[PDB]
Curated annotation (Swiss-Prot), chain B:
The keyword tRNA processing does not apply. SUPFAM superfamilies: Cell cycle regulatory proteins. One of its GO terms (molecular function) is ubiquitin binding. InterPro entries: Cyclin-dep_kinase_reg-sub, Cyclin-dep_kinase_reg-sub_sf. This is Cyclin-dependent kinases regulatory subunit 1. Coiled coil: none annotated. Gene3D superfamilies: Cyclin-dependent kinase, regulatory subunit (3.30.170.10). PROSITE patterns: CKS_1, CKS_2. Keywords: Acetylation, Cell cycle, Cell division. The modification N-acetylserine is found at residue 1. It comes from the Eukaryota. PANTHER family: CYCLIN-DEPENDENT KINASES REGULATORY SUBUNIT/60S RIBOSOME SUBUNIT BIOGENESIS PROTEIN NIP7 (PTHR23415).
Amino acid sequence: KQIYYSDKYDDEEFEYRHVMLPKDIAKLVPKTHLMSESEWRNLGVQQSQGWVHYMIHEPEPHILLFRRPLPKK
Amino acid sequence: SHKQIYYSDKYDDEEFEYRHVMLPKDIAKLVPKTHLMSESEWRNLGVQQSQGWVHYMIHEPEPHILLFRRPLPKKP
């Protein structure tokens, strides 16, 4: 498999997006704490900047929810 | 599923920058069977990406997958 990034969906202050990890590397996503910008890059998830892991997902561990405030506004 | 379309990483080389959008199989049919798309055509599918992308090939085996590519600068 490979990593797939979705389309962005934004709200009143955040441009949203989530990554789809192959179950292969999903078993490296810590379940106890959010990943640091430096942490997820080490996984394989290449993105721009300002994209930060904002929420832990216990149900579906292969989905990394990312956030970032609207385009350097 | 608040999302269905998926973009892969920009695997590139010293000539062209690649990527490939992945449509949900419930749309493969709206994808022109006989010709390559124009920016307008794929944007219509809902594929959102940088303007410079170009539909250079139809993925025969599994058609629901769009194959884009763009030129990588430096010579020229």
